[PDB]
Each structure stands twice: as structure tokens, then as C-alpha cells.
Design a protein around this motif. Structure first.
Motif, PDB file in Angstrom:
ATOM      1  N   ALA A   1       0.809  -1.203   0.000  1.00 15.11           N
ATOM      2  CA  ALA A   1       0.000   0.000   0.000  1.00 15.11           C
ATOM      3  C   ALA A   1       0.853   1.269   0.000  1.00 15.11           C
ATOM      4  N   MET A   2       2.200   1.107   0.069  1.00 12.27           N
ATOM      5  CA  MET A   2       3.070   2.268   0.219  1.00 12.27           C
ATOM      6  C   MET A   2       3.500   2.778  -1.163  1.00 12.27           C
ATOM      7  N   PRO A   3       3.860   4.077  -1.361  1.00  7.96           N
ATOM      8  CA  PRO A   3       4.004   5.062  -0.287  1.00  7.96           C
ATOM      9  C   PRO A   3       2.755   5.774   0.249  1.00  7.96           C
ATOM     10  N   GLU A   4       1.620   5.687  -0.473  1.00 10.30           N
ATOM     11  CA  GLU A   4       0.382   6.402  -0.173  1.00 10.30           C
ATOM     12  C   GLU A   4      -0.186   5.977   1.177  1.00 10.30           C
ATOM     13  N   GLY A   5      -0.071   4.676   1.486  1.00 12.02           N
ATOM     14  CA  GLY A   5      -0.318   4.165   2.820  1.00 12.02           C
ATOM     15  C   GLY A   5      -1.717   3.581   3.033  1.00 12.02           C
ATOM     16  N   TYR A   6      -2.108   3.504   4.310  1.00 11.25           N
ATOM     17  CA  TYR A   6      -3.327   2.820   4.690  1.00 11.25           C
ATOM     18  C   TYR A   6      -3.922   3.362   5.970  1.00 11.25           C
ATOM     19  N   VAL A   7      -5.245   3.273   6.018  1.00 13.45           N
ATOM     20  CA  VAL A   7      -6.006   3.658   7.173  1.00 13.45           C
ATOM     21  C   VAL A   7      -6.213   2.384   7.968  1.00 13.45           C
ATOM     22  N   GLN A   8      -5.758   2.413   9.240  1.00 15.21           N
ATOM     23  CA  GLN A   8      -5.908   1.343  10.218  1.00 15.21           C
ATOM     24  C   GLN A   8      -6.973   1.767  11.218  1.00 15.21           C
TER      25      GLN A   8
ATOM     26  N   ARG B   1      -8.381   5.495  14.622  1.00  9.21           N
ATOM     27  CA  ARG B   1      -8.213   5.726  13.196  1.00  9.21           C
ATOM     28  C   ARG B   1      -6.863   6.398  12.978  1.00  9.21           C
ATOM     29  N   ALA B   2      -6.071   5.713  12.163  1.00  6.65           N
ATOM     30  CA  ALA B   2      -4.693   6.095  11.956  1.00  6.65           C
ATOM     31  C   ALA B   2      -4.421   6.011  10.461  1.00  6.65           C
ATOM     32  N   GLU B   3      -3.502   6.862   9.998  1.00  3.05           N
ATOM     33  CA  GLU B   3      -2.970   6.845   8.660  1.00  3.05           C
ATOM     34  C   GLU B   3      -1.487   6.547   8.727  1.00  3.05           C
ATOM     35  N   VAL B   4      -1.085   5.410   8.176  1.00  4.23           N
ATOM     36  CA  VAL B   4       0.317   5.062   8.087  1.00  4.23           C
ATOM     37  C   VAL B   4       0.815   5.330   6.648  1.00  4.23           C
ATOM     38  N   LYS B   5       1.870   6.132   6.431  1.00  2.00           N
ATOM     39  CA  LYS B   5       2.267   6.517   5.077  1.00  2.00           C
ATOM     40  C   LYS B   5       3.655   7.155   5.074  1.00  2.00           C
ATOM     41  N   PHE B   6       4.276   7.220   3.904  1.00  2.00           N
ATOM     42  CA  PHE B   6       5.522   7.949   3.806  1.00  2.00           C
ATOM     43  C   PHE B   6       5.234   9.426   3.604  1.00  2.00           C
ATOM     44  N   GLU B   7       5.882  10.217   4.462  1.00  2.00           N
ATOM     45  CA  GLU B   7       6.006  11.644   4.270  1.00  2.00           C
ATOM     46  C   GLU B   7       7.474  11.863   3.931  1.00  2.00           C
ATOM     47  N   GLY B   8       7.782  11.750   2.629  1.00  8.00           N
ATOM     48  CA  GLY B   8       9.159  11.705   2.186  1.00  8.00           C
ATOM     49  C   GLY B   8       9.861  10.459   2.722  1.00  8.00           C
ATOM     50  N   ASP B   9      10.981  10.635   3.418  1.00  8.54           N
ATOM     51  CA  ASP B   9      11.750   9.531   3.981  1.00  8.54           C
ATOM     52  C   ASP B   9      11.049   8.860   5.168  1.00  8.54           C
ATOM     53  N   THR B  10      10.236   9.622   5.919  1.00  7.88           N
ATOM     54  CA  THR B  10       9.797   9.276   7.255  1.00  7.88           C
ATOM     55  C   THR B  10       8.500   8.482   7.175  1.00  7.88           C
ATOM     56  N   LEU B  11       8.450   7.334   7.849  1.00  8.83           N
ATOM     57  CA  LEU B  11       7.185   6.620   7.954  1.00  8.83           C
ATOM     58  C   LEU B  11       6.344   7.167   9.114  1.00  8.83           C
ATOM     59  N   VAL B  12       5.102   7.526   8.824  1.00 10.08           N
ATOM     60  CA  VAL B  12       4.269   8.296   9.722  1.00 10.08           C
ATOM     61  C   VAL B  12       3.134   7.386  10.172  1.00 10.08           C
ATOM     62  N   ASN B  13       2.851   7.431  11.483  1.00  6.35           N
ATOM     63  CA  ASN B  13       1.643   6.894  12.076  1.00  6.35           C
ATOM     64  C   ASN B  13       0.878   8.004  12.779  1.00  6.35           C
ATOM     65  N   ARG B  14      -0.077   8.582  12.071  1.00  6.90           N
ATOM     66  CA  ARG B  14      -0.860   9.688  12.586  1.00  6.90           C
ATOM     67  C   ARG B  14      -2.251   9.166  12.961  1.00  6.90           C
ATOM     68  N   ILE B  15      -2.597   9.338  14.255  1.00  7.64           N
ATOM     69  CA  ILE B  15      -3.661   8.640  14.983  1.00  7.64           C
ATOM     70  C   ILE B  15      -4.659   9.636  15.564  1.00  7.64           C
TER      71      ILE B  15
ATOM     72  N   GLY C   1      -9.063  -4.670   1.332  1.00  5.91           N
ATOM     73  CA  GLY C   1      -8.197  -4.468   2.480  1.00  5.91           C
ATOM     74  C   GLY C   1      -8.051  -5.752   3.261  1.00  5.91           C
ATOM     75  N   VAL C   2      -7.660  -5.592   4.534  1.00 10.19           N
ATOM     76  CA  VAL C   2      -7.557  -6.723   5.430  1.00 10.19           C
ATOM     77  C   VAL C   2      -8.252  -6.387   6.749  1.00 10.19           C
ATOM     78  N   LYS C   3      -8.471  -7.442   7.518  1.00  7.85           N
ATOM     79  CA  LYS C   3      -9.071  -7.344   8.832  1.00  7.85           C
ATOM     80  C   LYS C   3      -8.501  -8.421   9.757  1.00  7.85           C
ATOM     81  N   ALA C   4      -8.763  -8.221  11.050  1.00  7.65           N
ATOM     82  CA  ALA C   4      -8.322  -9.109  12.102  1.00  7.65           C
ATOM     83  C   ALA C   4      -9.173  -8.930  13.349  1.00  7.65           C
TER      84      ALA C   4
ATOM     85  N   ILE D   1      -5.156   3.887   1.156  1.00 12.23           N
ATOM     86  CA  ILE D   1      -5.392   5.278   0.800  1.00 12.23           C
ATOM     87  C   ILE D   1      -5.345   5.442  -0.728  1.00 12.23           C
ATOM     88  N   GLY D   2      -4.492   4.723  -1.460  1.00 13.21           N
ATOM     89  CA  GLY D   2      -4.484   4.829  -2.908  1.00 13.21           C
ATOM     90  C   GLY D   2      -5.722   4.219  -3.576  1.00 13.21           C
TER      91      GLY D   2
END
Length: 244
Positions: A84-91, A106-120, A175-178, A203-204
Motif C-alpha cells: 500500500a506504500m508510499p500512499e499508505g493505509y487507514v488502520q 483511526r490512523a494513517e500510516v504513510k511515507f512523508e518523504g523519507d519518514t514513515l508516519v503513524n498519525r492517529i 483491504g484486510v481485517k483481524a 489510501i491509494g
């Protein structure tokens, strides 16, 4: 080789940001550290920037990056999280605490340039001021009832009970689930059940590898920085995939 693998190849800097409201008790957590997918390893230092965390730090471990797990060569086709990268995924999770309240996350995991972001974003509801969560009654652990620099990382996690979460595909969501259980210990020696349901969407627009049903196997260690003044947690997770 496959989508988004080359982005994980060395040491990836992490940024975690979280804002929360549990029974009206407002809080923020920020943090930084490193993901190394080649090790299935994660290390963070997360700080409560508003003062005292109003829930126990163990309860946010699951909330505060399955993209850093190490998928073996036979299983690289099932790695939804890297694909799903670099655009990422909603967890998204619901977490029910037995005889207490629950979290919605609700979190967005994605690349913001070099940095992997977990914004919650976290909300929680129906907790008891006097119970195990808002009472702070849980112990501080996650013990659930290169060859070199790596072996240093594994030393900290050897011995810790493993925890296996089954990842299943949801075709409708692309997507996936658990569903899984976290059994927090209390000091008194009993357990606090945290009943986790999880949903991940890309997200893509464009498609993804929807995986066969497999497990992610975690061992987590919580510690402190001895020089840090604030309320904080150091979290290291060793995560690998198997079972397909």
C-alpha cells in the motif's frame, strides 16, 4: 521486488502523532524512532506532551505499524502493508475492555518523504473513573498470559510470550481485517481483557495484493529512557509473518 519493498530496505525513521479523548480526558502523544523491516523490528519513544497519560501506556501499545514486520521470501506476495506504500493505509480499530469502556481508533500510516508516519485519532467512552484503565491498575509490561546489531535487538525480546494475530482479507474493502485478544496483567495477578477488532484500507485508488489468511507473530518490550523527565514509554516490537 514487489510494490513498496525497496522503501523498507534499510533503517526507516518513524514519526508517531496521536490525539486522544477518553471519557473527556484529553491528551496528546508524539514520538520518533526507527523501523527495520529486514529484522521485523520496531523501536519508539513516545511521550505524553500534555502531562500525565490518563490511560495506562500498555493499553496504547497496539495503537502506537505492521509494515515493519518481516515477511519471509515464500510470503512476500501476502504483504498487504508494504504493497500500500508510499500512499499508505487507514488502520481502524475498535477495542472493547471487558466490564469497562472502549477505544475507537483511526490512523494513517504513510511515507512523508523519507519518514514513515503513524498519525492517529483516539476516542474512548464508557470507562469507570475507578476501574483498571482510568485507575491505572495495569502492570508496565506486554507479557500476555546484519547478524550483530540485530542480535542486540533480539536480546531485549527473547523470553517474552509471543502473540499471533490472524490477518484475513476483506474483498469488499479491498483491504484486510483481524480479530484478536490482548490480556493485560494487573499487579494483583488477574487479567484485563482488551478485545481488538481491526480494519485496514489502502489510501491509494489503485489495487493491492489481498493476502491469503496468515499470522503476524509479535513480542513486545516496554522500558523507559532513564534521562527522560516526562511521562513516556519506550516500545520495541519484533514482528514476523507465517502460517501460509
Amino acid at each position: 521486488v514487489s510494490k513498496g519493498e525497496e522503501l523498507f530496505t534499510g533503517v526507516v525513521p518513524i514519526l508517531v502523532e496521536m490525539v486522544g479523548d477518553v471519557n473527556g480526558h484529553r491528551f496528546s502523544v508524539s514520538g520518533e524512532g526507527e523501523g527495520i523491516a529486514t529484522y521485523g523490528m520496531l523501536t519508539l519513544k513516545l511521550i505524553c506532551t500534555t502531562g500525565e497519560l490518563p490511560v495506562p501506556w500498555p493499553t496504547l501499545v497496539t495503537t502506537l505499524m505492521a509494515c515493519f514486520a518481516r515477511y519471509p521470501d515464500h510470503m512476500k506476495q501476502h504483504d498487504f502493508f508494504k504493497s500500500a506504500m508510499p500512499e499508505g493505509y487507514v488502520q481502524e480499530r475498535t477495542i472493547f475492555f471487558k466490564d469497562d469502556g472502549y477505544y475507537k481508533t483511526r490512523a494513517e500510516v504513510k511515507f512523508e518523504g523519507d519518514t514513515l508516519v503513524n498519525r492517529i485519532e483516539l476516542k474512548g467512552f464508557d470507562f469507570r473513573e475507578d476501574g483498571n484503565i482510568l485507575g491505572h491498575k495495569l502492570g508496565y509490561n506486554f507479557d500476555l498470559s546484519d547478524f550483530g546489531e540485530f542480535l542486540k535487538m533480539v536480546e531485549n525480546v527473547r523470553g517474552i510470550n509471543s502473540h499471533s494475530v490472524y490477518i484475513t482479507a476483506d474483498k469488499q474493502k479491498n483491504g484486510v481485517k483481524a480479530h484478536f485478544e490482548i490480556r493485560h496483567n494487573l499487579e494483583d495477578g488477574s487479567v484485563q481483557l482488551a478485545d481488538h477488532y481491526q480494519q485496514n484500507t489502502p489510501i491509494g485508488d489503485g489495487p493491492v495484493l489481498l493476502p491469503d489468511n496468515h499470522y503476524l507473530r509479535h513480542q513486545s518490550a516496554l522500558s523507559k529512557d532513564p534521562n527522560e523527565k516526562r511521562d513516556h514509554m519506550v516500545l520495541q516490537e519484533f514482528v514476523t509473518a507465517a502460517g501460509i
